[PDB]
């Protein structure tokens, strides 16, 4: 289990807010490190369909 | 304490505290240290 | 990703270093927050090049009134609940260690 | 050999292959795919001249959309379900 | 060393993708390993381009890297933990050593019993009702109407009810509609419920 | 319960033989690939044992099936040795059914609603199954060797191309007819265990669920699931030992782990792999036994009910 | 006597209870022929409508990819008129109508027949709501598991035909139609070509059928108070319930179908092993244990919702119309409702 | 499913892999603009380029067709109350749907009113533009966007206008017409959105027409010739007439 506070339960100061934001962004990047980018996902979704009848335009 | 001797019967007065097959009392039955 | 100019950051906070300004720009903050964080870090002596973990959330080097530079570490805290507090000894956010005895030595 | 320090072929588990799993034609199709995965790009047949229609020679702006999307994508691949569009769309439902 | 225990050599070991990069057998107890740090060149370039007018960053073009599986919880070592917790009776002094390694750390074990834990409501209710036949042995059985004039006329009253329905008064009551039509027919020695009655036929007397 | 039986109509010996042969033929034809996969999994796991941990502990039958199909032989590759398997199964069924029916007729109770206790029925069934397995051991040996050929190295393969061809090769190359009865004791033990560990649990759970939920149609199949599971639990170690003995090649150098008997094979298995090693391919064995029992029971019940209705029994007597 | 296991037949004495209703009584209309006929009818109609809708939508997208999308009502009308006359649209309509016939007959009909077989006997409470609905959960689960793999062979055949149509002449089988492809594939590639790696389709079908049939049957009785006490429109309430059921089915089914994109279509990291090792089951487990739902819910509507949900909605409506969700309700204090009439008025 | 072969799927996979391997986060752009004059930046290191009060200059209350939409609510309420058509209970109750849906388009229009840029600044380096807007409720939203993500539209707003040769500034420097620009990726309130269109009203002063045009056309501005003016005239949460 991972704590949601990341060690900063309270943002009593803007410095604490900045530290939490930095570490949260780093953690999100690490978690998202294993999935494709927005462009790749969008193109795959758009051109998923491959079932046509007549070809050779 | 089965087929493996971990405790020391020398330092244990009675070896019957736990089930086992590898311990024997140093002062066995009928043994009486007498001055 | 709209990184602010490191030269502008240095100008706004004269005493900050180019490497620190560049690292702050790389950090994903809006330019205003980048400038404010640079100001705070320079003024406090906090080392921005520190990866926050569950042991310490930040570190700083400060020259005390006796002229000696000392290191001050900001511990990870909890909200009135030691049970929720993560007792660990690694630079890891994950709560890996589970202790049957909270106070080992009483 | 009896000793398990080093592997021996006596414990090898690999079934011999005698023919393509799904046929010679399937094997040929797989080879063609490997050779020309990107170089062969078939397209569906569509008429090239329609009176009423206007050819799509450029990307259209967002003002041409009949519907407004609610979800969105972060540039790092994350999928946002909570967006300002959702915030404004939830007002009528919550009110009712 | 035994190759049978090595996934790389032994192909019969099914590697778990969700545990890639995590080896519970290598944990420290207390854990003192750093497996996370600053990561760049994924979306945020490590180099400097703030003042480069000829370079514009496109975060959309994020190259795909290796999946980072969530850390796996530590797994118990049966022999090591048993030896660690073992204490000699009248030989060991009652005290806690200075070293922190003596702390009793909790480690996950076999997951089989948790299947029974998850199925406990079903198992508990089955034991309460089906195993004990609570409230009675007939509540959970498929219901069958009593046979014709069974066990006795005073309780069943099938023939008398049939005669009443076939009588003038029964027909008049059915016409009034306050009483519903007859639901069974007395065949040659047996009672058969009409399909619209929505009930099973009486069980055979054997 | 001692008078809960309803044996108001008993098929003749010829009818029993014919119906059993046909139904077992179709059941074996339907469920042979599962047994093939189970045997291949046992062979591949022989000498190594289960090395995965927790939920992965075991060998994946789907993985084995996919690997076998990838060889390029299609679904026909899963029926290799099917002729030998069918011949052996038919001979075993014929002998066992004949002996069991003879003994049952000799020692049946007079009353139609009384039947032999489960203990006596199990004793008779075990004796019949042991005799049949001892008589028909060579067919099972040939079938198992043909199945294991693919898994084993080509130099260790036997290259049998039929039941008769395998029998002749074993008799000539290995020398003597005694070579045809290798693993006969293990086969007899497996047959006895399977005969005694199926009829009991089925009736147990069937009667219990009848008492709980009364008379329904899912009771028979739930009892079938329970009986198949417990029969697999009881019999799988013996099947594994029989497979190991059959796969043991004559040449010790060819053999990866030579065995001298049933006890020696059990000792070697325990030494080189935990007691869990006896239950490799448990899912495949359970699926095979459940499908076989289900199809056999379904067809037999349908035909028997039709015959009883033709005879003129009452609804409850059927 | 016949083989190792003996199916012992036993006789039992009479037993009866006070109440003969609200339990399990097989409906007279629940027969192998009748249930199969109704299920086949409903499934065929729903599949035809669904496949026509999908063909129309896909042809509209194909035309729009080359021509600008409509700007007003007149432009939309002419766009539809030109779509209807496309040769590609007509061929797709024909082939997908054949596919609709096949699948509605062999998968949706099978699902409806099995559900009716396993759930026809669950009676309801007179002047009340059917409690103890948990008894129906095992039945619906059994039906879903039994009928889950009935569509994978047809779907794989359809995919094989559409992918064959896009190969050069030399490497093209030359299937005349979907039926011809379905008849030829089993003998050319083998039966296992239509079942290999079928986990995504099987789990998708299981979730669809279960969470659709069970949820609709539950709601149509539990929310009935709207029209039984509130005097609301019964047909409108049933339509809303069917819409909710189909939406829930799509939501619960799409994530499992997403495994196709992650395993095959996602770019592979050079020099590293596949994240999921090419196992759809492992990918599905990763989806199940993933923290963020949106990551695998991306593309829910552009990909699967408008290809699945309308068919399920129509299937539910047609099943309700024919009577595949009709239970028998009889008064518990009536003549056949109970065996103790002395306390029904006293 | 993978054993089934489809050339379209193979092409899609190849295209995805080729894109991933070829196009990197870092990109090379030659669209650099060097302003003739020296840029005087504020004390905050920013130069103001656009200013307007869209809420002040726009119609909020009496707007067509929202007045038409909302004028029908009394008609539906009266119809429900008096049942002039002699409808059934459910049929008459169906007339009460319109009052609950009539005001949605006005809400959407009021929301859109907050996408008109109120203030626009260019940061140091000529690569970041800060856009500040407000909602009709007074909430203030500021967002930073990279210059390359801008795409101007035609005067008709129905197409993308040519970035190189776009005629939307009069000779003196003001806008000929209300300009529209689509931002490919906009980060609003820490949430990224795709293809968001924003507007610069014609009734709005344009400072530094060269810089404004460069940002609109997406050129990266070269800020080498710069001076810093230390003027602390703007306070936090400063009042304005855009209310
Ligand atoms: C037993 C009963 C049975 C009854 C009969 C059943 C018969 C079968 C019916 C089958 C229906 C099939 C529908 C398939 C549609 C496929 C769409 C699709 O693929 O979309 C992909 C789309 C992504 O596409 P994309 O390519 O990425 O888009 C990119 C473009 O940039 C962005 O897109 P764009 O801006 O370029 O869009 C172009 C535009 C195409 O261009 C146009 O719009 C031009 C045409 C303009 C005229 C508009 C219609 C005029 C009036 C006629 C209405 C006929 C509708 C018939 C269908 C009804 C059922 C759907 O295309 C669309 O957006 C879709 C147009 C479809 C019409 C939508 C409006 C319908 C209003 C209905 C009013 C009531 C009518 C009553 C009729 C009487 C009888 C019932 O993603 C989605 O799927 C999103 C769809 C979201 C729709 C819902 C939005 C509101 C949600 C709020 C909640 C409301 C519902 C509450 C719950 C209710 C239930 C409990
Ligand atoms: C055939 C069954 C048929 C079906 C029916 C079954 C009915 C079961 C009961 C249903 C309700 C509870 C179900 C909970 C199951 C999950 C337990 C669990 O969390 O996993 C173990 C988990 C250990 O794993 P972990 O926490 O994930 O990580 C540590 C690693 O395991 C590493 O741990 P380690 O390093 O410490 O190594 C040892 C580890 C290695 O071994 C294992 O993990 C093996 C698998 C677990 C076996 C669990 C039971 C073993 C036998 C216990 C017998 C009593 C002690 C005598 C000595 C036994 C020596 C074997 O073993 C354990 O930790 C096992 C400790 C169990 C202690 C039991 C006594 C606790 C006091 C009783 C409180 C509950 C009262 C309930 C009744 C109330 C009536 C008014 O231990 C616990 O969390 C402790 C739970 C203790 C209470 C629940 C289990 C005991 C239930 C006793 C029977 C109650 C019957 C009442 C109804 C019928 C009456 C006739
Ligand atoms: C420590 C254990 C604790 C208990 C747990 C148990 C766990 C066990 C496994 C794990 C441990 C490792 C194993 C240790 C086993 C220890 C016991 C032992 O010694 O057993 C070995 C014993 C033998 O093992 P083995 O050394 O491998 O011997 C087998 C050879 O592999 C066989 O070689 P083959 O397969 O090549 O055979 C070829 C066939 C070659 O064929 C021949 O025999 C050729 C010569 C005769 C030909 C003629 C046959 C008849 C036909 C002609 C008739 C006349 C003509 C008729 C008219 C003409 C037409 C035919 O040979 C045979 O027939 C078999 C060999 C004997 C032949 C010599 C003559 C015997 C005459 C008597 C029998 C007659 C009937 C036999 C057939 C069956 C009935 C149908 O195995 C067992 O007993 C099996 C396991 C134990 C079963 C009993 C269960 C006890 C446990 C109860 C539950 C306990 C729970 C509480 C815990 C208690 C803890 C203490
Ligand atoms: C009715 C029972 C109701 C019970 C209700 C219970 C309710 C409570 C519990 C609910 C949850 C239960 C979950 C069960 C465990 C699932 C575990 C899992 O996810 O992993 C399994 C397995 C994972 O394997 P893997 O190693 O990870 O491989 C991954 C590949 O993606 C996929 O693996 P693959 O590609 O290697 O394997 C695909 C599989 C595909 O197989 C199929 O499509 C056949 C259906 C069963 C497949 C189940 C998987 C294989 C299991 C072992 C062998 C099964 C034998 C057949 C079924 C009976 C025994 C179970 O192919 C084969 O194994 C060979 C197929 C043979 C070739 C085609 C010829 C078929 C026979 C034609 C002639 C006879 C029939 C017609 C003529 C009749 C006479 C006139 O995944 C699946 O195959 C699908 C699992 C889906 C789970 C969701 C729930 C649906 C479950 C449906 C299964 C039952 C279908 C209906 C047949 C049985 C009743 C009649
Ligand atoms: C240290 C180890 C020493 C080992 C050697 C010495 C000890 C040997 C001990 C053997 C024990 C055998 C137990 C059998 C199982 C009994 C289970 C039981 O009683 O369950 C209750 C039930 C009771 O059944 P029931 O008939 O009373 O009715 C059940 C229904 N109710 C409860 C309603 C009455 O018994 C069974 O189900 C038994 C089924 C199996 C019966 C057959 C057993 C094996 C017979 C083998 C015969 C010979 C075969 C050929 C051999 C060839 C080689 C020689
Ligand atoms: C308790 C008193 C008795 C005396 C003292 C105890 C001595 C005996 C101790 C035995 C311990 C258990 C040994 C088996 C362990 C199996 C572990 C396992 O599941 O492995 C993975 C195997 C793997 O099988 P697989 O190869 O099919 O793999 C499928 C699994 N995946 C998909 C993950 C690969 O799983 C199973 O086989 C599951 C069922 C196990 C059933 C074990 C039954 C043991 C019975 C032994 C005695 C005989 C029965 C007697 C009672 C009934 C009849 C009367
Ligand atoms: C939170 C959990 C509890 C949820 C509520 C459950 C309430 C009822 C108690 C059930 C407990 C077990 C779970 C079973 C759920 C599904 C089956 C069910 O509920 O059975 C009800 C139904 C018959 O009931 P019905 O006749 O409709 O009742 C009114 C009659 N006038 O029967 C059927 O539909 C037939 C079902 C046959 C299969 C049932 C298998 C149950 C197994 C339970 C575990 C048994 C454990 C035994 C352990 C023994 C150890 C030695
Ligand atoms: C059932 C009670 C137990 C269940 C939990 C109850 C929680 C209550 C929380 C408060 C909010 C919900 C409204 C109250 C419950 C539902 C209405 C009800 O109890 O039924 C009675 C009500 C009025 O009927 P009444 O006038 O008393 O009948 C006399 C006839 N001579 O009849 C009506 O007027 C019908 C109104 C139905 C509204 C249902 C809304 C909740 C269901 C989920 C959302 C459904 C959305 C779609 C509805 C479509 C309707 C066409």
Automatic annotation (TrEMBL), chain A:
Similarity comment text for this entry: Belongs to the heme-copper respiratory oxidase family.
Protein's recorded name: Cytochrome c oxidase subunit 1
Function: Component of the cytochrome c oxidase, the last enzyme in the mitochondrial electron transport chain which drives oxidative phosphorylation. The respiratory chain contains 3 multisubunit complexes succinate dehydrogenase (complex II, CII), ubiquinol-cytochrome c oxidoreductase (cytochrome b-c1 complex, complex III, CIII) and cytochrome c oxidase (complex IV, CIV), that cooperate to transfer electrons derived from NADH and succinate to molecular oxygen, creating an electrochemical gradient over the inner membrane that drives transmembrane transport and the ATP synthase.
Gene: cox1
Subcellular location: Membrane; Mitochondrion inner membrane
From TrEMBL, chain B:
Highest taxon listed in the record's lineage: Eukaryota
Name of the protein this chain belongs to: Uncharacterized protein
Automatic annotation (TrEMBL), chain G:
Subcellular localization(s) per the UniProt record: Membrane
InterPro entries (alphabetical): MCP_dom_sf (IPR023395), MCP_transmembrane (IPR018108), Mito_Metabolite_Transporter (IPR050391)
Solcar repeat residue intervals: 131-222
The organism's place on the tree of life at top rank: Eukaryota
Major localisation: membrane
Pfam families, A to Z: Mito_carr
Residues spanning the signal sequence: none
GO cellular component: membrane
Family from the record: Belongs to the mitochondrial carrier (TC 2.A.29) family.
PANTHER family on file: MITOCHONDRIAL DICARBOXYLATE CARRIER-RELATED
Name this polypeptide is given: Oxoglutarate/malate translocator protein, putative
Organism: Tetrahymena thermophila (strain SB210)
From TrEMBL, chain H:
The keyword Transmembrane is annotated on this UniProt entry: yes
Regions crossing the membrane: 66-85, 91-110
Keywords (A to Z) from UniProt: Membrane, Transmembrane, Transmembrane helix
Superkingdom, taxonomy of origin: Eukaryota
Protein name in the entry: Transmembrane protein, putative
Portion of the parent chain present: 106 to 348 of 348
């Amino acid at each position: 289990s991972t704590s949601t506070t990341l060690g900063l339960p309270r943002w009593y100061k803007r410095i604490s807010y900045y530290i939490f934001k930095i570490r949260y962004l780093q953690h999100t990047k690490s978690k998202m490190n294993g999935i494709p980018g927005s462009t790749v996902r969008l193109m795959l979704i758009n051109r998923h369909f491959v079932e046509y009848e007549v070809y050779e335009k | 304490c089965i087929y493996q001797a971990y405790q020391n019967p020398l330092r244990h007065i009675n070896t019957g505290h736990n089930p086992n097959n590898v311990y024997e009392d140093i002062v066995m039955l009928g043994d009486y240290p007498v001055q | 990703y709209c990184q602010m100019d490191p030269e502008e950051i240095m100008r706004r906070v004269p005493g900050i270093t180019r490497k620190e300004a560049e690292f702050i720009t790389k950090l994903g903050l809006s330019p205003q927050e980048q400038v404010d964080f640079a100001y705070i870090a320079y003024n406090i002596g906090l080392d921005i090049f520190y990866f926050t973990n569950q042991m310490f959330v930040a570190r700083q080097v400060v020259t005390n009134s006796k002229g000696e530079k000392v290191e001050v570490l900001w511990n990870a805290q909890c909200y009135e609940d030691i049970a929720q507090l993560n007792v660990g000894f690694a630079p890891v956010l994950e709560s890996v260690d589970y202790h049957w005895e909270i106070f080992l030595w009483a | 050999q009896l000793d398990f320090s080093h592997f021996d072929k006596a414990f090898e588990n690999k079934y011999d292959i005698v023919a393509p799993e799904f046929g010679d034609l399937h094997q040929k199709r797989a080879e063609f795919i490997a050779k020309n995965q990107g170089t062969y790009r078939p397209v569906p047949l569509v008429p090239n001249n329609i009176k009423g229609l206007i050819p799509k020679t450029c990307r259209l702006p967002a003002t041409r959309n009949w519907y407004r999307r609610t979800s969105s994508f972060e540039r790092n691949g994350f999928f946002n379900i909570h967006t300002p569009v959702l915030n404004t769309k939830m007002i009528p439902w919550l009110l009712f | 060393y035994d190759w049978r225990d090595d996934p790389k050599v032994n192909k019969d070991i099914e590697e778990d993708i969700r545990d890639r990069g995590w080896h519970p057998e290598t944990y420290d107890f207390p854990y003192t390993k750093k497996h996370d740090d600053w990561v760049f060149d994924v979306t945020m370039p490590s180099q400097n381009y703030q003042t480069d007018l000829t370079v514009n960053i496109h975060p959309e073009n994020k190259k795909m890297h290796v999946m980072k599986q969530v850390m796996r919880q530590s797994y118990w070592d049966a022999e090591h933990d048993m030896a660690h917790e073992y204490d000699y009776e009248s030989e060991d002094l009652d005290f806690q050593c200075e070293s922190f390694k003596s702390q009793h750390f909790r480690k996950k074990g076999p997951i089989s019993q948790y299947l029974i834990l998850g199925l406990l409501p079903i198992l508990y209710f089955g034991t309460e009702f089906f195993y004990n036949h609570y409230p009675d042995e007939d509540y959970w059985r498929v219901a069958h109407p009593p046979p014709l004039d069974y066990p006795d006329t005073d309780d069943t009253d099938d023939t008398e009810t049939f005669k009443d329905y076939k009588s003038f008064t029964g027909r008049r009551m059915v016409d009034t509609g306050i009483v519903d039509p007859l639901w069974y027919d007395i065949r040659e020695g047996k009672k058969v419920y009409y399909d619209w009655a929505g009930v099973n036929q009486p069980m055979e007397d054997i | 319960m001692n008078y809960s039986y309803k044996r108001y109509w008993e098929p003749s010996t010829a009818e029993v033989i014919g119906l059993s042969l046909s139904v077992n033929t179709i059941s074996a034809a339907l469920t042979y690939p599962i047994e093939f996969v189970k045997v291949r999994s046992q062979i591949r796991t022989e000498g190594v044992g289960i090395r995965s941990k927790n939920l992965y502990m075991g060998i994946n039958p789907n993985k084995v099936f996919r690997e076998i199909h990838a060889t390029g032989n299609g679904l026909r590759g899963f029926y290799q040795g099917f002729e030998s398997h069918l011949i052996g199964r038919l001979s075993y069924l014929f002998i066992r059914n004949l002996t069991y029916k003879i003994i049952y007729d000799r020692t049946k109770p007079v009353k139609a609603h009384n039947d032999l206790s489960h203990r006596e029925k199990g004793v008779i069934a075990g004796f019949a199954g042991g005799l049949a397995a001892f008589l028909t051991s060579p067919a099972d040996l040939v079938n198992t060797r043909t199945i294991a050929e693919g898994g084993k190295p080509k130099e260790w393969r036997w290259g049998y191309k039929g039941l008769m061809d395998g029998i002749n090769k074993i008799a000539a190359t290995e020398g003597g007819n005694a070579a045809l009865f290798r693993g006969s004791y293990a086969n007899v033990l497996r047959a006895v265990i399977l005969n005694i560990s199926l009829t009991g649990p089925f009736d147990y759970l069937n009667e219990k669920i009848w008492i709980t939920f009364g008379d329904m149609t899912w009771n028979k199949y739930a009892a079938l699931l329970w009986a198949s599971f417990w029969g697999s639990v009881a019999t799988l170690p013996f099947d594994n030992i029989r497979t190991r003995l059959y796969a043991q090649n004559a040449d010790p150098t060819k053999n990866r782990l030579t065995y001298s008997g049933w006890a020696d094979a059990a000792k070697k298995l325990i030494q080189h792999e935990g007691i869990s090693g006896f239950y490799v391919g448990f899912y495949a064995f359970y699926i095979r036994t459940f499908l076989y029992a289900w199809t056999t029971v379904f067809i037999t019940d349908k035909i028997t009910s039709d015959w009883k209705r033709k005879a003129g029994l009452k609804e409850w007597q059927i | 006597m016949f083989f190792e296991l003996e199916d012992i037949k036993r006789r039992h004495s009479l037993y009866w209870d006070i109440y003969n209703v609200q339990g399990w009584v097989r409906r007279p209309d629940s027969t192998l022929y009748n249930n199969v006929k109704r299920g086949v009818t409903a499934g065929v109609v729903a599949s035809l409508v669904q496949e026509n809708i999908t063909a129309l939508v896909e042809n509209c997208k194909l035309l729009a990819t080359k021509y600008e999308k409509p700007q007003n009502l007149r432009q939309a009308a002419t766009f539809m008129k030109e779509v209807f006359k496309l040769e590609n649209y007509r061929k797709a309509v024909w082939n997908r109508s054949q596919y609709a016939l096949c699948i509605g007959t062999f998968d949706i009909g099978a699902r409806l027949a099995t559900f009716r077989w396993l759930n026809n006997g669950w009676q309801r409470v007179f002047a009340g709501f059917e409690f103890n609905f948990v008894r129906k959960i095992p039945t619906t689960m059994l039906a879903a598991l039994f009928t889950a793999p009935f569509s994978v062979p047809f779907e794989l055949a359809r995919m094989a035909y559409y992918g064959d149509k896009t190969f050069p002449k030399e490497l093209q089988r030359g299937y005349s139609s979907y039926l011809s492809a379905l008849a030829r594939i089993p003998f050319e590639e083998g039966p296992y070509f239509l079942f290999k790696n079928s986990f995504p389709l099987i789990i998708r079908n299981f979730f669809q059928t279960f969470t659709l049939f069970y949820t609709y049957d539950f709601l149509k009785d539990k929310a009935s108070f709207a029209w039984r006490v509130g005097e609301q429109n019964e047909y409108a309430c049933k339509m809303i319930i069917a819409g909710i059921s189909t939406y829930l089915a799509a939501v619960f089914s799409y994530p499992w179908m997403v495994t196709r994109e992650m395993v095959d279509f996602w770019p592979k990291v050079p020099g590293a092993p596949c994240t999921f090792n090419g196992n759809y089951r492992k990918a599905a487990v990763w989806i199940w244990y993933h923290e963020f739902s949106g990551n695998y819910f991306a593309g829910f509507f552009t990909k699967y919702f408008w290809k699945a949900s309308p068919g399920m909605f129509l299937t539910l409506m047609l099943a309700d119309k024919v009577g595949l969700f009709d239970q028998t309700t009889v008064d518990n204090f009536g003549g056949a409702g109970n065996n103790s009439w002395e306390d029904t008025f006293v | 499913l993978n054993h089934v072969q489809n050339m379209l799927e193979e092409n899609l996979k190849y295209d995805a892999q080729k894109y991933n391997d070829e196009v990197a986060v870092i990109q090379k752009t030659s669209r650099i603009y060097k302003p003739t004059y020296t840029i005087e930046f504020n004390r905050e290191g920013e130069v103001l380029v656009y200013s307007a009060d869209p809420i002040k200059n726009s119609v909020v209350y009496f707007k067509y067709p929202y007045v038409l939409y909302e004028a029908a609510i009394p008609l539906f309420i009266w119809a429900w109350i008096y049942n002039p058509l002699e409808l059934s209970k459910n049929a008459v109750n169906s007339l009460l749907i319109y009052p609950n849906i009539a005001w949605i388009p006005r809400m959407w229009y009021w929301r859109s009113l907050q996408y008109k840029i109120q203030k626009m600044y260019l940061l140091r380096g000529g690569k970041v533009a800060k856009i500040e807007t407000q909602s009709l409720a007074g909430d203030r939203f500021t967002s930073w966007v990279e210059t390359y993500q801008f795409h101007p539209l035609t005067q008709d707003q129905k197409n993308f206008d040519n970035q190189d040769n776009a005629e939307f500034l009069e000779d003196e420097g003001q806008l000929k017409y209300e300009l529209g620009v689509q931002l490919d990726n906009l980060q609003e309130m820490g949430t990224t959105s795709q293809d968001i269109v924003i507007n610069f009203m014609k009734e709005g002063t344009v400072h530094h027409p060269e810089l404004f045009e460069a940002i609109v056309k997406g050129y990266n501005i070269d800020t080498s010739d710069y001076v810093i003016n230390t003027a602390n005239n703007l306070r936090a949460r400063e009042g304005n007439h855009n209310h």
